[PDB]
C-alpha cells in the first residue's frame, strides 16, 4: 500500500518517520523514560 | 441488514471505531452448534464365545498394498529403510510446549 | 502448576460420570451426546466432534478418532468449563 | 478449545473429504480447485512437509465441457518407447477411450511436480456418472460449488421471465419467417 | 406473419405477429440493439435476443428485415453459431461431446499435432473477435486464445 | 557457502509461506490476498504477514473480525469510487492524521 | 492345468462335469494355445535370423554376432531391440 | 415505463457480484457508540481471561501473551531480571472480543509488561565467501548478542 | 484442384465457397479451374 500511503503522505515504508518506528520502543516499569534508541 | 461477511459459521463479528476515532472495537461471540442441525449418536449356546484371534500371515507384497489401500498412499512409504538412516535418525527430539 | 491441563495434573477415570453426578448435584438435566460434526467414518483415520448438549443448549464439544473417545473428550471439555480450568481462563498474577 | 493434547492435534490435522461435479463444468477449472485442496494449500496451517492433502470425490467426469473446439484441438500425447510409441489422440478420442482421463491428466499436472504428487493422486477419487460407492459417499463432507454457472438454455425459461424480457424489433407482417 | 400451406393448392395468409416493446430506453438508436441500449451488453447465452432474431429452424434473419446494423448483425450471427454448438437452442432445430464458445465449426478443425515453441506457440481460439469489444466487468481482458 | 546463502533463501522462504497461509485463511472467510492486505493498509492496521498467519491458525475469531474490516473497506472504496462526488467519506475509511 | 474360457451366460455347464473329444466335430475349426519348445538362451541367428557375417575374407572373431545395435547418436538402446536371450 | 437508460436482463447488462448497500452514517454511529460502550463494560466488569497482544518491538512484531518468552536479536543495555513497559501494542484482544489500534493503542489504553530475564549470545555463525577458478575463499564466524525477554502480564483498562 | 495461395475466377460460373476451413474456388462448367486455397 505505498501509493495509498504517499497519498495520505504517510511515506511509503510504514518503517519511514511514523509514530511506529519513532516512538520508543520501551520503558521502565514506574515509568522512567528509556535511553534513546540508536536508529 | 448489513454484514461484511456471513454470520453463521464463526462468530458473530460486529465491527465498532471509537468516538475519538483512533481505535476500531471488534466483538465476536462464537457461534454454537444447534441441537436440530446436529444428528443422533450411532448404536453358541454351548460352547465358549472363543475369541475370533486369526491372523494371517499376508507377504510382503500384499501386505503393502492393503496398507496403502488403506491409507490411501504408495508403497515407498512402507517399504523398509537401511541401518545408515535408521541410525542417523533421532530418537531423542527436542520437544517444545 | 504453570503450562500443564487439569487432567494432565489431576487423573480421572470416568469423566462422563463425574460430570452427570456435577450436574444432578448443581440441578442440571443429564447431558445428551450427539454427533455435531463427522468426517470420514468408514476410513482407518475418521474425525468426529461429538457435543454434549443440556434442555437443547450445548455445553460441551470434543473432538476424537472414534465416537467413544469424542464423548470422553467432550466429558473432560465439560468438566474443565465447569470447574474454570479452560486453557483460556485467567493467568496466574503474581 | 480447552481440547487434550491428541484430540486437539487430530482435529486440526484431520483429512476433509470434499464433494466436486463435472455436469458441464471445465476441467481446468475443476482440476485448479481440486488441486488446491489435494495439496492442502486451502488449509491455514498449510506446509509441505506436514501432509495436510484431503481427499477429493469428483463425480460426473463424462460431461464435462471444453471452451471453444479444445474437444479436436488439443492432443495428448504419450509414447510406448519401443520405436514406434509416439502415440497423439485428441481430447474426444481420450475422452471416449477413458471418461475421466482428461479430469486425470488435468489435475496430474496442476500438482506440484515432487514425489508426493503420486500421494495426492491416490487421495484423488474421480468417478463418470453419478454413481459414487457407499463408503465414499458415507465418507463425503461439503460438495464445493461448481466453476461454472451452467448457461441455461431457451427451452428452459419461465414464462414471467420471457415476457418480462421487451422485444427488440417489430417484423413485417408480410414476411414468410 | 405470413405462411404458406399446400393442399393442388398452394395459399399464403397472415398470422398474428408481436409489435414493439412500447416505450425504448434511447429512441434515437437505429438499430434495435442502439434503440434498447445493449451495444457491448450481450454474449451467447442471451437466447431470448438471439431467439427473437433467428428462425425458427435455427437460421438467421436478413439485415433488411431485422432493422439492424451491419456490427451488431454480424456480432448477432457469431453468437447464434456458438449458441447453436453450446446446445442453448433445443428447438430450432434442422430439417456427445458438451462445448460452450466454440467458434469454429466442430467437424473443420485439425488437431493440434505440433504445438510450436513458446515464442510461437499455436494457441486454441476461444470465443469471438467480434465480441472481443464487450463490457469487460472485471481488470483482466477476456483471452480469446487459449 | 549453502549455510549463508540458504540464510538469504530462509527469509524468502518463510515470507512466501505466511503468504501462502493468509490467502488460504482469506480464501475462507471469502476474500482474496490482495483485497485483504490493501484494505488493512487503508484501515491503518500495520499487522504483518508473520502475525496474520498467526492470527490466522491460532485466533479465528480475531481473524474474521479483520477479515470483515478489510471487505467494509472495501465495499467503502467502491462506494466512493461509484459516488465520485462529496459524500461522506465513510466511517472505516477516516484516516487519523498524525504531526 | 487348468485353463479358463471364456464364455455366454448360455454356455455354463456344473463344475465337476467330464468332457471328451467328441465336444468338436469333423471339418471344424480351432484355436491351439501351447508353451512352445524351449531353446535356452540363443543367439541372434537362431533367434531372430540375422544374416551374421562372413566365415572367411579376413574376420576376426565375428561369425555370428549382431552388429550395430542402435546408432551413434541415440546415446542408448531402443526398448525391444532383437538381442540373444532365452528363446 | 422504461427509464432512459433502462437495460434488459442479460447476462452481463449489469455487473456479477451482488449488489452492496452501506448502512446509513447516524444510525452506524450509534451502532458504534452502543457496541464500543458495551465492549467498555464487559472490561469493567472482568469477563475475560488471558489476554493476548500483538506488540511492535526491535523492528519486529510479536504475537504475545501472558507468562511468554520472546528472544530479541540485540543488547537493550538492562540488567537482567528487570521490569520494563513495552508500549507500541498494534493489537489487544482476548475471547469474545478485540481491539485494534491505528496504528497503536492508547498507553492509558492497554500496557505489557516484560522482565529482561537473559543476555546471552547466539550460537557461532559461519559466513562464508568462495568463488571457483579465482582462489576466493573467506570465512568469518559471528556471535550476535540476545536477550530473552518474558511477558508477565497484559492488562487493559477501560477508556473506550 | 489446383493448389493455390491467392484464388481468382477464371469464368464466370466460378463461385467461391468455404468448406472444411479453407476456401475453394468450384466451377461446373471448366472443372479445371477448381482450385484450393493453402
Ligand atoms: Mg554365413
Ligand atoms: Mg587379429
Ligand atoms: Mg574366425
Ligand atoms: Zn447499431
Ligand atoms: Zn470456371
Not at chain 5, 453459431?81 to 466454440?102: D, E, F, I, S, V
Not at chain 8, 519486529?60 to 520472546?70: G, N
Not at chain 8, 492497554?110 to 577458478?133: G, H, L, Y
Request: net charge positive; charged share 25%.
Amino acid at each position: 500500500g505505498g501509493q495509498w500511503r504517499l497519498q495520505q503522505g504517510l511515506a511509503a515504508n510504514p518503517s519511514g518517520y511514523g509514530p511506529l518506528t519513532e516512538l520508543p520502543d520501551w520503558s521502565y516499569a514506574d515509568g522512567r523514560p528509556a535511553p534513546p534508541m540508536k536508529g | 441488514t448489513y454484514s461484511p461477511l456471513p454470520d453463521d459459521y464463526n462468530c458473530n463479528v460486529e465491527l465498532a471505531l471509537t468516538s475519538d476515532g483512533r481505535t476500531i472495537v471488534c466483538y465476536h461471540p462464537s457461534v454454537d452448534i444447534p441441537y436440530e442441525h446436529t444428528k443422533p449418536i450411532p448404536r453358541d449356546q454351548v460352547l465358549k464365545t472363543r475369541l475370533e484371534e486369526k491372523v494371517e500371515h499376508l507377504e510382503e507384497g500384499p501386505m503393502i498394498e492393503q496398507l496403502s489401500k488403506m491409507f490411501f498412499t504408495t508403497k515407498h512409504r512402507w517399504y523398509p529403510h537401511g541401518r545408515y538412516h535408521r541410525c542417523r535418525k533421532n530418537l531423542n527430539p527436542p520437544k517444545d510446549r | 502448576m504453570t503450562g500443564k491441563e487439569l487432567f494432565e495434573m489431576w487423573k480421572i477415570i470416568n469423566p462422563m460420570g463425574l460430570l452427570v453426578e456435577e450436574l444432578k448435584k448443581r440441578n442440571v438435566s443429564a447431558p445428551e451426546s450427539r454427533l455435531t460434526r463427522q468426517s470420514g467414518g468408514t476410513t482407518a483415520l475418521p474425525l468426529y466432534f461429538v457435543g454434549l448438549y443440556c434442555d437443547k443448549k450445548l455445553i460441551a464439544e470434543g473432538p476424537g478418532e472414534t465416537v467413544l473417545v469424542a464423548e470422553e473428550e467432550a466429558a473432560r471439555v465439560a468438566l474443565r468449563k465447569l470447574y474454570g480450568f479452560t486453557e483460556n481462563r485467567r493467568p496466574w498474577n503474581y | 478449545s480447552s481440547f487434550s493434547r491428541a484430540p486437539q492435534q487430530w482435529a486440526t490435522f484431520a483429512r476433509i473429504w470434499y464433494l466436486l461435479d463435472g455436469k458441464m463444468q471445465p476441467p481446468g477449472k475443476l482440476a485448479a480447485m481440486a488441486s488446491i485442496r489435494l495439496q492442502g494449500l486451502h488449509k491455514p496451517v498449510y506446509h509441505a512437509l506436514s501432509d495436510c492433502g484431503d481427499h477429493v470425490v469428483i463425480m460426473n467426469t463424462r460431461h464435462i465441457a471444453f471452451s471453444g473446439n479444445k474437444w479436436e484441438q488439443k492432443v495428448y500425447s504419450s509414447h510406448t518407447g519401443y520405436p514406434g510409441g509416439f502415440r497423439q489422440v485428441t481430447a474426444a478420442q481420450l475422452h471416449l477411450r477413458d471418461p475421466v482421463a482428461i479430469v486425470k491428466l488435468a489435475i496430474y499436472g496442476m500438482l506440484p511436480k515432487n514425489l508426493h504428487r503420486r500421494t495426492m493422486m491416490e487421495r484423488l477419487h474421480l468417478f463418470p456418472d453419478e454413481y459414487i460407492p457407499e463408503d465414499i459417499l458415507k465418507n463425503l463432507v461439503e460438495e464445493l460449488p461448481q466453476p461454472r454457472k451452467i448457461p441455461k438454455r431457451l427451452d428452459e425459461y419461465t414464462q414471467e421471465e420471457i415476457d418480462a424480457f421487451p422485444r427488440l424489433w417489430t417484423p413485417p407482417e408480410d414476411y414468410r419467417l | 406473419f405470413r405462411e404458406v400451406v399446400e393442399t393442388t393448392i398452394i395459399e399464403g395468409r397472415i398470422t398474428a405477429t408481436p409489435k414493439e416493446s412500447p416505450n425504448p430506453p434511447n429512441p434515437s438508436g437505429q438499430c434495435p440493439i442502439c434503440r434498447w441500449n445493449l451495444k457491448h451488453k450481450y454474449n451467447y447465452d442471451d437466447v431470448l435476443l438471439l431467439s427473437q432474431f433467428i428462425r425458427p429452424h435455427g437460421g438467421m434473419l436478413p439485415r433488411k428485415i431485422t432493422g439492424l446494423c451491419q456490427e451488431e448483425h454480424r456480432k448477432i450471427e457469431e453468437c447464434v453459431k456458438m449458441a447453436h454448438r453450446a446446445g442453448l437452442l433445443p428447438n430450432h432445430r434442422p430439417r456427445q461431446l458438451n462445448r460452450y464458445l466454440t467458434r469454429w465449426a466442430p467437424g473443420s478443425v485439425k488437431p493440434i499435432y505440433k504445438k510450436g515453441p513458446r515464442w510461437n506457440r499455436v494457441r486454441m481460439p476461444v470465443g469471438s473477435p467480434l465480441l472481443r469489444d464487450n463490457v469487460c466487468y472485471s481488470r483482466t481482458p477476456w483471452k480469446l486464445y487459449h | 557457502v549453502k549455510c549463508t546463502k540458504a540464510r538469504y533463501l530462509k527469509k524468502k522462504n518463510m515470507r512466501t509461506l505466511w503468504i501462502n497461509r493468509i490467502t488460504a485463511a482469506s480464501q475462507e472467510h471469502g476474500l482474496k490476498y490482495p483485497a485483504l492486505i490493501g484494505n488493512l493498509v487503508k484501515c491503518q492496521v500495520e499487522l504483518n504477514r508473520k502475525v496474520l498467519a498467526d492470527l490466522a491458525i491460532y485466533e479465528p475469531k480475531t481473524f474474521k473480525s479483520l477479515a470483515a474490516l478489510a471487505s467494509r473497506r472495501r465495499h467503502e472504496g467502491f462506494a466512493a469510487a461509484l459516488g465520485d462526488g462529496k459524500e461522506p467519506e465513510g466511517i472505516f475509511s477516516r484516516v487519523v492524521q498524525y504531526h | 492345468t487348468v485353463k479358463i474360457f471364456n464364455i455366454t451366460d448360455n454356455a455354463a455347464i456344473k463344475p465337476g462335469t467330464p468332457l471328451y473329444a467328441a465336444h468338436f466335430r469333423p471339418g471344424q475349426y480351432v484355436d491351439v494355445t501351447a508353451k512352445t519348445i524351449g531353446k535356452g538362451f540363443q543367439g541372434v541367428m537362431k533367434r531372430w535370423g540375422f544374416k551374421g557375417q562372413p566365415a572367411t575374407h579376413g574376420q576376426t572373431k565375428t561369425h555370428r554376432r549382431p552388429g550395430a545395435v542402435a546408432t551413434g547418436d541415440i546415446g542408448r538402446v531402443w526398448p525391444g531391440t532383437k538381442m540373444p536371450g532365452k528363446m | 415505463s422504461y427509464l432512459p437508460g433502462y437495460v434488459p436482463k442479460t447476462s452481463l447488462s449489469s455487473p456479477p457480484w451482488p449488489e452492496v448497500v452501506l448502512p446509513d452514517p447516524v444510525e452506524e454511529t450509534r451502532h458504534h457508540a452502543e457496541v464500543v460502550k458495551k465492549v467498555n463494560e464487559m472490561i469493567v466488569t472482568g469477563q475475560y481471561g488471558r489476554l493476548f497482544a500483538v506488540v511492535h518491538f526491535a523492528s519486529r512484531q510479536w504475537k504475545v501473551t501472558s507468562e511468554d518468552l520472546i528472544l530479541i536479536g540485540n543488547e537493550l543495555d538492562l540488567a537482567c531480571g528487570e521490569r520494563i513497559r513495552l508500549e507500541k501494542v498494534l493489537l489487544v484482544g482476548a475471547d469474545n472480543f478485540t481491539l485494534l489500534g491505528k496504528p497503536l493503542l492508547g498507553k492509558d489504553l492497554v500496557r505489557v509488561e516484560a522482565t529482561v530475564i537473559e543476555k546471552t549470545e547466539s550460537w557461532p555463525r559461519i559466513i562464508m565467501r568462495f568463488r571457483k577458478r579465482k582462489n576466493f575463499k573467506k570465512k568469518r564466524i559471528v556471535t550476535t548478542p540476545q536477550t530473552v525477554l518474558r511477558i508477565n502480564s497484559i492488562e487493559i483498562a477501560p477508556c473506550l | 484442384f489446383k493448389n493455390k495461395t491467392v484464388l481468382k475466377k477464371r469464368c464466370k460460373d466460378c463461385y467461391l465457397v468455404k468448406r472444411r476451413g479453407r476456401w475453394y474456388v468450384y466451377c461446373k462448367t471448366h472443372p479445371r479451374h477448381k482450385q484450393r486455397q493453402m
